[PDB]
């Protein structure tokens with residue numbers, strides 16, 4: 334059944350924490366673990382990082398932590414590096430169910446010369462490689478938390494939540510779904526529908542697949558899960574199978590859920606959105622609806638939640 338989590342006083346706050354720690358005086362947290370989430374055929378490396386904040390940097394699901402990687406700011410001699418934000422992939426109780434850790438889902442940003450494929454360490458992403466290279470006991474300069482766009486609307490515990498992720502965009506949804514299904518949170522008993530769509534490059538690039546598949550078996554009447562593997566699947570038109578093509582497969586169900594008040598969430602890199610918008614426009618047109626008008630209504634009704642970069 335549901336996992337006991339502590340301390341329940343984390344449910345008492347009525348507002349999310351924001352900017353508890355700031356860049357000039359970050360919280361020095363400690364790495365608990367770092368593990369690759371992906372198999373050898375994955376085009377890139379994505380890691381799961383567990384960080385001990387000791388209960389000093391609590392957060393709500395959907396927020397981000399800032400990390401200040403070591404070194405001097407290249408564009409600002411004598412200054413610390415700029416904060417990089419990472420979507421927290423854990424619930425407020427964390428992966429140890431104790432309110433002392435938070436987790437990140439971090440894609441290594443690696444540079445390859447577009448012609449030769451060669452590498453250059455001065456051009457890899459600083460913070461993503463810093464994090465995925467970390468080992469237990471390493472210290473991390475933590476700031477935040479920050480962000481409110483992806484806070485989970487809990488007013489209606491029987492709401493519908495349609496979660497659209499590419500790659501590390503799955504992070505907030507791992508936290509949402511643990512809160513909805515895994516953890517014993519007496520003041521939030523989810524009885525709605527949560528529907529996760531995840532687009533990645535191939536099967537080896539899947540993130541947390543075992544956890545999500547387990548929810549299908551534990552909460553079959555409350556959870557749905559669809560995956561789009563761009564390099565291993567092709568869409569109805571011959572294009573690579575992107576998450577928007579999976580959305581299109583369920584277009585009638587999704588549009589009806591939206592009309593009924595479902596929340597819809599988009600998270601990941603911003604390049605995911607143009608194809609999604611194109612598909613939604615096409616779906617709307619086939620149904621005889623204006624996607625522009627529908628989207629305006631979804632935004633007005635606070636059903637549309639996008640955090641991409």
Ligand SMILES: Cc1cc2nc3c(=O)[nH]c(=O)nc-3n(C[C@H](O)[C@H](O)[C@H](O)COP(=O)(O)OP(=O)(O)OC[C@H]3O[C@@H](n4cnc5c(N)ncnc54)[C@H](O)[C@@H]3O)c2cc1C
Nearest residue numbers: 417418419420438439440442456457458459460461501642
């Ligand atoms: C709200 C928010 C949440 C986020 N959540 C996540 C998350 O959960 N997971 C995640 O992985 N990311 C997330 N990101 C992105 C993350 O913040 C970083 O931007 C990302 O990790 C890259 O940072 P970095 O320090 O590794 O790369 P940087 O050092 O900032 O470099 C940026 C890019 O420039 C490239 N580059 C550097 N020098 C050169 C050069 N000379 N020529 C060509 N290219 C170069 C790097 O390879 C890299 O791709 C989020 C962003 C935001 C705004």
Ligand SMILES: NC(=O)c1cccnc1
Nearest residue numbers: 420501502601640641642
């Ligand atoms: N988790 C992510 O990949 C993410 C979230 C928000 C902005 N950019 C990237």
Ligand SMILES: [Mg+2]
Nearest residue numbers: 371372537539
């Ligand atoms: Mg795998």
